[PDB]
Amino acid sequence: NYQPTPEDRFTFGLWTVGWEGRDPFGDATRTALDPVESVRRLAELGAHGVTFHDDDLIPFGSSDSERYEHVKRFRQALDDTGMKVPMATTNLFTHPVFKDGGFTANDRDVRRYALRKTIRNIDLAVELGAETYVAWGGREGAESGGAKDVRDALDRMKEAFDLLGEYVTSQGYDIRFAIEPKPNEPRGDILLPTVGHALAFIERLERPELYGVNPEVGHEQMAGLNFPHGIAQALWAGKLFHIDLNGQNGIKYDQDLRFGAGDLRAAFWLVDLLESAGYSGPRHFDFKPPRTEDFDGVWASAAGCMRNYLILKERAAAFRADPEVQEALRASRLDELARPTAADGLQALLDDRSAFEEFDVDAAAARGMAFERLDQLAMDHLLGARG
Amino acid sequence: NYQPTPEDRFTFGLWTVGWEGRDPFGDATRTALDPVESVRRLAELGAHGVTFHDDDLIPFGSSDSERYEHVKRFRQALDDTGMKVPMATTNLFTHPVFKDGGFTANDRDVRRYALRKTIRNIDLAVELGAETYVAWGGREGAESGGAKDVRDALDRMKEAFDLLGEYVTSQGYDIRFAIEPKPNEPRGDILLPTVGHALAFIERLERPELYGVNPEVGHEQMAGLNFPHGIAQALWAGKLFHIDLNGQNGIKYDQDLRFGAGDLRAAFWLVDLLESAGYSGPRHFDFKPPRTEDFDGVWASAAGCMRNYLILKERAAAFRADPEVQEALRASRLDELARPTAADGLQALLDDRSAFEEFDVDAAAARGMAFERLDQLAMDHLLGARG
Amino acid sequence: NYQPTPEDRFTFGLWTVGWEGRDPFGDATRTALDPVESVRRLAELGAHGVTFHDDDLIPFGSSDSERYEHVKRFRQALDDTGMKVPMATTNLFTHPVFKDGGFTANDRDVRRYALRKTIRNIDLAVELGAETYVAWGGREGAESGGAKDVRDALDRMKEAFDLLGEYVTSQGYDIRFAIEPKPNEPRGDILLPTVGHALAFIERLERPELYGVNPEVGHEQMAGLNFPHGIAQALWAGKLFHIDLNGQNGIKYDQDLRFGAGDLRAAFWLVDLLESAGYSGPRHFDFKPPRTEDFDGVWASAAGCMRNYLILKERAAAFRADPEVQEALRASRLDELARPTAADGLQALLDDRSAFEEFDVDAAAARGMAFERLDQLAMDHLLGARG
Amino acid sequence: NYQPTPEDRFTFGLWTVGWEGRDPFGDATRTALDPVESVRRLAELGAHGVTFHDDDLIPFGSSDSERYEHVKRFRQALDDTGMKVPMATTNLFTHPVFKDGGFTANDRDVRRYALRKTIRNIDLAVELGAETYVAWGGREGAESGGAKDVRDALDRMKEAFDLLGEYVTSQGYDIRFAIEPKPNEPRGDILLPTVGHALAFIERLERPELYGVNPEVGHEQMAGLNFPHGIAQALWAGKLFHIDLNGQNGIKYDQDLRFGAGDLRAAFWLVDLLESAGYSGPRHFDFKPPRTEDFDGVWASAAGCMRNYLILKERAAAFRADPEVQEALRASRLDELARPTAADGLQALLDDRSAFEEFDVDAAAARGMAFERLDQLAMDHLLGARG
C-alpha cells in the first residue's frame, strides 16, 4: 500500500543510491552506477527528482567537452522520465586540496579556487532548473585549537557567502542558498554546527533574504538535539528552504540510515510538523543503503524511505483529526499556549493584581498538565492501536 | 602562587558555594549558608563579586518587610567587603508553579506571573548595581512531542522578552539581558538549546541590541559541542555579555564541576580566546562543590576555580608570546586566514585565471598544514614542558 | 484494547508511581502516596506485584515497633489484592552517610553499616516472598581520579557480595542477587557501568551461581549501547535474573520515561527477544511519571507502560509468524548463522581447500545480505502497515 | 627534553603512520609508505617495535612467493634497526567479503575463510616473535535488529575463539590472544562493545587463560566511559594483555588523535595507573596523523605520542611521591579503602553493635571526604604549578 507519486515531491541525491560502500575501514562493495540509470530507477519508484554535487555528475578534471556530454546525457534522462532537479550543491570536501576547508581554508589560493568551483556549478544548477543551491561546509573546522582562529574563519565564511549573493544578484538568477549544518565528521568540530548556529550566521550576511537552512535529521541528532524542535525554530524564522531526511541512532558517526530507521518517534513528530506547517519544498533523502546490500537492496532501501514518510503522514493526520486528541490538546492547554500572554500591554500587566499580588500560586501549581495521556494517544495513533 | 584579586573580576553565584548537596537521588549533605557569610568568605578568597536569583536572597513568599530586611543585611555585607553584584537573575524553575515553564508555560496565568516575578527582580538588580540580567529558561521545553507547539512557544518567548525590553526602556535603566542556553535537564529538551539557537532568536526581538548570550561551559559540552568555537561565534556577533565557567566530563547530566576540571584542553583554549579578544566582563563561576565535601571542601573548590583560570591565563600568554609558536602559526598559514579572500572584488576573481583555469590543485593539495607540530607546542606550553 | 492481567507479570516499584517530582532544580509537585494506596491502585490497573527499597516501606530511623506496623499494614494490602512482591532492594544512596558509597565508601565504618542495613532487608524480603534481591550501587564511584583506587574498590565490592552470599547460604534462603549497572548519575562515573562490566565481575565472586544482572533500558542507553544486544549477552550467559523497563531519549540524564517512550524500535526488538527466549521473570517498570502530572497522570503513565509492552508483544509475534518474514530470514542467512562454523573440527577445517585455497572470495563478496528488505518488513509489522 | 628509548616499550602499528588519509568523505592526502621505511623512521624516533595486520605487510591476494619476499624485506629492516614485533593481528574488515563480519558473518563459508586467514597469520606472527595476537571484530555487529540473532552470533564467536585456542595449544605456540572491544563504527553496533563485555565473554571460552583484552582509549570514550576505571577492572581481573593509546574528544566518530590529545586529565590518570600497577607490556599507539598533514607532520605526530606519555609519567610520579599528596590521600581515607571491610567474618559483623545498633550515622555523614583539595593537588602536579 502507501505508494508514492511525483506529487509527493520525494527527491534523492545521485550520491545516495550511488554510494559504493567505501567506509573508513573498508573497500567498495558495489560497482559505480551511471547517473542515467539512477534517474531511470528512481523515476520507476515514484520519485519526483534528483539532486547532485558537481563532481557526482561531471568527473573532477573533465574537459569542457566531456563536461558537455555528461550534461547532455543527463538532460536526456530527465526528459525521458519527467524527473526534475530542484537542488544542486558543490563538492568542496573530497579532493585533497580541500583538506583544510573550501571557504575557510587557511590558504587564500584554495579559498579563491573554492569560490570559482562553486560559481561554475551555480550556472549549471540554474540551467537545469534548480531553485535551491545547498552549501555543506564539511571540511570547514579543525581537529586542534590553534589551527583555526574562528572569528577570522567566520569573516572568511561571510565573505564567501556575500560574494555568492553578489554573483546571483548580478546574473539575475532566481535561486536561493541553503546552509547545511553538521556538528562534526569529517572534521573534529565543524563550523556552524547546528541549525541555530547557521540561522544566527545568516543574520550577519549582506542580503540575509537569499539564505536559509537545509537541516538534516542525522546531523542534529549527532549533537543529541531534538530535530523537530530545530525545524520548528527554522520555520518560525521563515528559513526552512529545504530539508534532508534520513535516520540516525544517537550520538555516533553519521549513519545515514533510510528515513524512518533511527528514532522513529522523532520521525513521526517531524512529519506531523512538516505537514501541519504546510512545508512545500522537496522531501529530500540524503541516506546511504548499507554496504551489506546488493543493487536489489539499494532500491528496497530507497523505496522504504518514501514508504515510511507516507505511513507517518497518514498516522500524524489521523492523530490531529481525532476528536479525542483535540479534546486532550485542550485539556493540556495547547490552545492557551497559542494566545498572547499580554495583548493588554505592559502597563495593564503591571497593574493586574491577578497576575501577582492575588495570584494563587498553589492552585495553579496543583493543576496537572495531562501530557502523559496525550502522549499515549500519540503512541496509539503511531502504532495503529486506536486513539 | 597564582593569587586572585578583585581586579581579576571573578564572581560566584550565591547558589554555587551555597548548594546543600541535594541531588535526584539524595538528601542535602550540608547546612544552608547565610548569604552574608558567603559574601564574607568569597571576599576573603579574592573574589570580585557575587550574583543571585531573587529566591536565593529573599525566601519565596517573604512579606515586603522581611524582603527589606534581607536586602538591608545583604547590602551591609557588600559595603563591609567591597564586593559588587554585576549580574542578577530570576528563579523561574524551582517552585511547582513553573513545572511547565515560566515564559512558555501552556497556562497563560503562569506566563503573566512569571513576567511579574521577573520585573520585580529587575528593579532590585538595578538598585544593587547589576549591569547584566540573565534569563535561564530551564523549564521551557518538554518531555513529549505533543505537549508544546514550538512555534507558539517561541512566539510566547519573544513576547516575554519584548515586554522586558519595553519595561527597561521605559524606566530608563542601564541593564542588558543575557539568555543562557542549555540543551536539556531538567526538561527532556529545552528551547534555545545552544548558543547558536539563542543568537538566532535574539535577531527576531524588537530591540536586539538589548540582548546577548550568557553561555556556560558545561551546557554546550552536554551537546558535545566545542565551547571555545561557540564563544568565538558569540564574540564575532558582538553578543558575549557574560560567561559562566565550570567543568563537565562529556555528554551526561550537568556536573557543574569546578572550572579547570572536565575538559582541560578546552579550558585552555577558552582562556586563550577570552584573553586574546579582550573580553572584559565578569569571569563568573556557576559550579557546585561536590556533595562529598564539607565547608572546608566548599572553599577549596571555589579557590580552585580561580587558581585554574590564572594558571591557564599564564600558559596561554606564554604560548602566544613564544617566537617559535609565532613562527609555527605562520607555517600553518593562520596569517593567511586573516586576509580577505577577494578584496579585489567579484569581477576580478571571475577574471583571475590563477584562481581556476591555471590553479595547480595538486601542488596546493601537497602542502602540509603543519597543525600537529603547532598543537604539540600548545601541549608543551599547557604542561609547562617547553615551547 | 490490550488489557493486562496479573498473568502478564507486570510489576512496579513503590518509588515509581510514588515519585513526588523533586528534581535537581525543583521542589516536589505531588504529595506522598501511602504504599497501601499504591498497591490498591496498581492491582486495579492489572499489575501482578510491587517492589520496594527498605526505606520506601519503613521510613529511615523507624523503631522496631513502627517497623512492625508498616509491615503489617503492607501485608494486609497484599492479602486484600492478591499482589505479590517478587523483588526487593536496599536504599544505599539517599542518606548523607552514603555520599561516597555503601559497599565501596572509603570509610570502613560506613561499609560495615551498609552491609548490616542490607542484611536486615534481605530477611524482610524473604519474609514477603521475594525471589530476587537487587543491588544498585548508585553511590559507588567518583567525580575525580584520585578519590577512588578502583582495584581496591572492586576488592571491597567483591568482599561485600561474598559476605551476602555467605549470609543467604547460611540461612538457607532461596533468593538470588541481581546487580543493576548504571554508567553515571549520581556519581560522575559509577563502578560496574554496563551489563558487560557486571557480568565480568560476577565471575570473580566466590559463588557466581547466586548472582545475575538486573539491566535497565535507560541505563545502557545512557552509554549509547544497544539494549537488546546487551540483554542477548546476559541471556547467553544465563544471567538475566530480572529486568527493568523504561524509556530514555539518548545520552543525557536518566529520564525514566514510561516504557515504549524513548527509543521505540529498541523497545520492539527487546520485546521480540524476551518473548522469543522465553524469559519468565517479572516485567518490572522502574520509571517516573513526569513532574508535570497530577495523580490522574500518574495512573495514566503506569497504565501506558503495560499497554506498550502488550502492543509490542503482539507486533513482534505477528512479525515472527509471517511466512514472508520467515522467507526473508532465510534470504538473509539467519539460518546459517545458527549452524556451527566447523562441527567437522579443526583438522578438517585446516584440510578443507574450499575454506581457503579454493574459496571464491569475489563471488561470496557479491552476495547481498538483503537486510534492508527484512528491516522494512519489521517496520511494516511494528506500524501495523502489512508484512 | 623527554626523549624516548626502546626501553620505554613504545610501539606503533604500520597502519598508523602509514594511514594515507582516506576518510568517509575524502580521498587520500598522502602516498603509501613502504613498511621498511616506516620501521626505519620509527626506530630513529626511539620506538621499540611495530605491529601489523596481515594485509598491511602482505598485499591481499599475494602469491606464496611475493609473500616470502615481503617477509624477507621486512625481517631485514627489523634486523638492521633492532626493532621488535610484539603483537600482530588479522584484517577481517577491509575486503568486501567481510561486509557482514568474519567470525560472525551470517554466511558459514565466510566464517570458515575468516578462521583460515587468521590461522595463517598466527603462524607468521609466531615466526616474527609476537607474544600477543589481537582480534578486533570491527565487522561483527549490525545496523538493524533482525539481521543478527546475538545469541547465535556469540555461539559463533565462542566457536571461533575456541578453535584458535585449540590451534595454538596443538602447535605448542607461546602466544596469547587479546580481544579489542569497540562500541560502534563501522557497524551500527559492534558485538562485545566495551572492556566489560569482552571480559565477561572470555569467561565462557574453553581455555579462558589464553585470552585477555586489548582496550583502546578512544573506543571506551566513544561510549562515554571512564577509560582508567575500565583498565583498573581489566587489571583487577588479570587480563590486561596489551593496551592501545590514542586521544578522542568525546562521543563521536573514532578520531584516533595522537596520545595526550583528547581528554588530557584521563590520559594523566591512565599513566598514573599503568605506572603504579607495574604494567609491563607494550605502550602501543593506534592513532592516525590527521589528513591535513604531510610526512613531516606524520613524524611529528608519532613523536608527540611518546613525548606526551613521558611528560605524564613524570607528573604522575611527582604527584604520588609528594608528601603533601600522601597526607591528602590519608585525609580522604584512601588507606581505609584498602583495608578489608570485615576480615573479622560474617558472624562477628552481625554481632557488632557498632556496625548498626550503635553506629552514629549523623557523625559519619558530617565527615567531609576532602576530595576537592586532593583533586586540585593533582591538577597542580599535572600543570607543573606546585603540589
What is the number of alpha carbons within 13 Å of residue D199 lying toward its C-beta? Answer: 28
**β partners of residue D51:** D13
Residue listed under C-alpha cell 631485514: D76
CA distance D184 to chain A (A): 8
Is the Cα torsion angle A301, A307, A312, A313 positive or negative in sign?
Answer: positive
Which of chain A's residues have a Cβ under 8 Å away from the Cβ of D255?
143, 188
Longest alpha-carbon distance in chain A: 80
Bond before C289 cis per omega within 30 degrees: no
Which residues touch D345 (CB under 8 Å, ≥6 apart)? none
Backbone angles phi, psi at A26, to 5 degrees: -165, 155
Pair A178, A222: CB distance under 8 Å: no
Query: Could you tell me the strand order of the sheet in which D211-213 lies?
Result: D211-213, D176-179, D132-135, D87-89, D49-53, D10-13, D283-285, D244-245
Backbone angles phi, psi at D179, to 5 degrees: -90, 130
Q: Which amino acid belongs to residue C32?
A: A
D242 is in an annotated binding site: no
Pair B267, B305: CB distance under 8 Å: no
Nearest of D264, D253, D338, A123 to residue C224 by alpha carbon: D253
Of A147, A188, A252, the CB nearest to D255: A188
Which of chain C's residues have a Cβ under 8 Å away from the Cβ of D209?
none
Which residues touch A363 (CB under 8 Å, ≥6 apart)? none
Which residues touch A173 (CB under 8 Å, ≥6 apart)? A122, A126
> How far is Cα of residue B178 from the mean position of the Cα atoms in its chain?
9
Catalytic-labelled residue, pool C48, C54, C55, C56: C56
Is the Cα torsion angle C231, C234, C238, C241 positive or negative in sign?
Answer: negative
The DSSP element (H or E) to which D170 belongs, if any, is helix D150-171
How far, in Å, CA of C107 to CA of C114, rounded?
11
Longest alpha-carbon distance in chain C: 80
Pair C27, B94: CB distance under 8 Å: yes
Residue D144 to residue A261, Cβ atoms within 8 A:
yes
Backbone angles phi, psi at B105, to 5 degrees: -60, 145
* DSSP classification of residue C139: T
Find the length of chain A.
Answer: 387
Backbone angles phi, psi at C91, to 5 degrees: -90, 100
Bond before A96 cis per omega within 30 degrees: no
Which residues touch D381 (CB under 8 Å, ≥6 apart)? D315, D316, D318, D319, D322, D325, D387
Q: Which amino acid belongs to residue C269?
A: W
Residue A295 to residue C368, Cβ atoms within 8 A:
yes
The DSSP element (H or E) to which D45 belongs, if any, is helix D35-45
Is the Cα torsion angle C149, C150, C153, C154 positive or negative in sign?
Answer: negative
Nearest of A121, A52, A113 to residue A83 by alpha carbon: A52
How far, in Å, CA of A282 to CA of A242, rounded?
6
- DSSP-assigned letters across all residues of A79-137: HHHT-B--EEE---SSSGGGTT-STT-SSHHHHHHHHHHHHHHHHHHHHTT-SEEEE--
How far, in Å, CA of C223 to CA of A234, rounded?
30
How far, in Å, CA of D68 to CA of B2, rounded?
63
Q: Which three cell numbers stand for residue A40?
A: 531511470
Which of chain A's residues have a Cβ under 8 Å away from the Cβ of D19?
none
Residue C107 to residue D367, Cβ atoms within 8 A:
yes
Distances (CA, A) of D34 to C241, D17, D20: 54, 11, 12
Which residues touch B254 (CB under 8 Å, ≥6 apart)? B182, B185, B218, B219, B222, B248, C24, C253
How far, in Å, CA of B39 to CA of B8, rounded?
17
Question: In angstroms, how far is the first alpha carbon of chain A from the final one?
Answer: 22
Of C100, C147, C251, the CB nearest to D374: C147
Which residues touch C23 (CB under 8 Å, ≥6 apart)? B24, B186, C291
How far, in Å, CA of D94 to CA of C20, rounded?
54
Which residues touch B302 (CB under 8 Å, ≥6 apart)? B12, B16, B17, B42, B45, B47, B258, B285, B289
Pair A289, A352: CB distance under 8 Å: no
How far, in Å, CA of C384 to CA of D59, rounded?
50
How far, in Å, CA of C79 to CA of C76, rounded?
5
Q: Which three cell numbers stand for residue D117?
A: 586467514
Pair C130, C87: CB distance under 8 Å: yes
How far, in Å, CA of B329 to CA of D172, rounded?
56
Pair B153, B104: CB distance under 8 Å: yes
D256 is in an annotated binding site: yes
Residue listed under C-alpha cell 609466531: D126
Which chains are adjacent to chain C, needing at least 3 Cβ pairs under 8 Å? Answer: A, B, D
Four-way CATH pick for B1-387: 3.20.20.140, 3.20.20.150, 2.60.40.10, 1.20.1260.10 = 3.20.20.150
Nearest of D21, D86, D13 to residue D56 by alpha carbon: D13
How far, in Å, CA of C138 to CA of C183, rounded?
9
Clarify whether B56 is annotated catalytic: yes
How far, in Å, CA of D102 to CA of B5, rounded?
63
Q: Which residues of D are catalytic?
A: 53, 56
How far, in Å, CA of B80 to CA of C354, rounded?
90
**β partners of residue B67:** none
Annotation: binding site of C for Mg(2+)? 180, 216, 219, 244, 254, 256, 286
* DSSP classification of residue C51: E
How far, in Å, CA of D7 to CA of D13, rounded?
18
Backbone angles phi, psi at D224, to 5 degrees: 70, 20
**β partners of residue B259:** B261
Q: What are the residue boundaries of the structural domains of chain B, listed by start? A: 1-387
Pair C249, B188: CB distance under 8 Å: yes
**How crowded is residue C299: how many other Cβ atoms within 10 Å of its Cβ?**
19
Pair A158, A204: CB distance under 8 Å: yes
How far, in Å, CA of D130 to CA of D122, rounded?
9
Pair D195, D223: CB distance under 8 Å: no
**How crowded is residue D59: how many other Cβ atoms within 10 Å of its Cβ?**
10
Longest alpha-carbon distance in chain D: 80
**How crowded is residue B162: how many other Cβ atoms within 10 Å of its Cβ?**
17
- Kindly give the residue spans of alpha helices, DSSP state H, lying in chain C: 14-17, 35-45, 54-57, 64-81, 108-127, 150-171, 195-202, 217-221, 227-237, 264-277, 295-321, 323-331, 334-337, 346-351, 361-366, 371-383
* DSSP classification of residue B52: E
> How far is Cα of residue D236 from the mean position of the Cα atoms in its chain?
16
How far, in Å, CA of D167 to CA of D170, rounded?
5
Q: Which three cell numbers stand for residue D98?
A: 567481510
Q: What share of chain D is helix, strand, coil (3-state, %, to 5)?
A: 50, 10, 40
Bond before A340 cis per omega within 30 degrees: no
How far, in Å, CA of A195 to CA of B198, rounded?
11
Q: Which amino acid belongs to residue B139?
A: R
Find the length of chain D.
Answer: 387
Question: In angstroms, how far is the first alpha carbon of chain B from the final one?
Answer: 22
CA angle (A355 as vertex; A349, A361 as ends), nearest 5? 160
CA-based radius of gyration for chain D: 23
Q: Which three cell numbers stand for residue D232?
A: 583498573
- Kindly give the residue spans of alpha helices, DSSP state H, lying in chain B: 14-17, 35-45, 54-57, 64-81, 108-127, 150-171, 195-202, 217-221, 227-237, 264-277, 295-321, 323-331, 334-337, 346-351, 361-366, 371-383
Experimental method of this PDB entry: X-ray
Give the strand pairing for D141-142 and D189-190: antiparallel
Q: In chain B, which residue's Cα lies nearest the Cα of A349? A: B112
What is the number of alpha carbons within 13 Å of residue D258 lying toward its C-beta? Answer: 26
Q: Which three cell numbers stand for residue A68?
A: 558537455
How far, in Å, CA of A214 to CA of A180, rounded?
5
CA distance B346 to chain A (A): 6
Pair D130, D88: CB distance under 8 Å: yes
- With H, G, I as helix, E, B as strand and everything else as coil, classify residue A226: coil
CA-based radius of gyration for chain A: 23
Q: Which three cell numbers stand for residue D351?
A: 554481632
One-letter-per-residue 3-state SS of A242-306 = CCEECECCCCCCCCCECECECCHHHHHHHHHHHHHHCCCCCEEECCCCCCCCCHHHHHHHHHHHH
C-alpha torsion A351→A352→A358→A360, nearest 10:
-140
Distances (CA, A) of C278 to A179, C275, C281, C306: 51, 5, 9, 18
Q: Which three cell numbers stand for residue C369?
A: 545480505
> How far is Cα of residue B24 from the mean position of the Cα atoms in its chain?
24
**β partners of residue D179:** D135, D213
Q: Which three cell numbers stand for residue D119?
A: 590461522
Q: In chain D, which residue's Cα lies nearest the Cα of A31? A: D96
CA distance B37 to chain A (A): 31
How far, in Å, CA of B118 to CA of B131, rounded?
15
CA distance C367 to chain A (A): 7
Nearest of A227, A202, A203 to residue A213 by alpha carbon: A202
Give the strand pairing for C189-190 and C141-142: antiparallel
Distances (CA, A) of C59 to C34, C56, C75: 12, 7, 16
Pair D126, D90: CB distance under 8 Å: no
To one decimal, the resolution in angstroms is 1.6
Find the length of chain C.
Answer: 387
Q: Which three cell numbers stand for residue A230?
A: 530545530
- DSSP-assigned letters across all residues of C256-304: -BPBTBS-HHHHHHHHHHHHHHT--S-EEE-----TT--HHHHHHHHHH
Pair A258, A303: CB distance under 8 Å: no
How far, in Å, CA of A309 to CA of A325, rounded?
22
How far, in Å, CA of B248 to CA of B244, rounded?
12
How far, in Å, CA of A72 to CA of A52, rounded?
15
A262 phi-psi bin (left φ>0, alpha ψ -120 to 50, beta other): left
Pair C199, D154: CB distance under 8 Å: no
Nearest of A231, A312, A225 to residue A268 by alpha carbon: A312
CA distance C251 to chain D (A): 9
- Number of cross-chain residue pairs from C and D with Cβ atoms under 8 Å apart: 326
How far, in Å, CA of D131 to CA of D86, rounded?
6
Question: In angstroms, how far is the first alpha carbon of chain C from the final one?
Answer: 22
CA angle (D116 as vertex; D112, D122 as ends), nearest 5? 145
Q: In chain D, which residue's Cα lies nearest the Cα of C98? A: D365
Which of chain B's residues have a Cβ under 8 Å away from the Cβ of C29?
96, 99
Bond before A59 cis per omega within 30 degrees: no
Of B104, B117, B183, the CB nearest to A225: B183
Find the length of chain B.
Answer: 387
Catalytic-labelled residue, pool B48, B53, B242, B284: B53
10 Å CB burial of residue C358 (0-12, 13-18, 19+) is: exposed
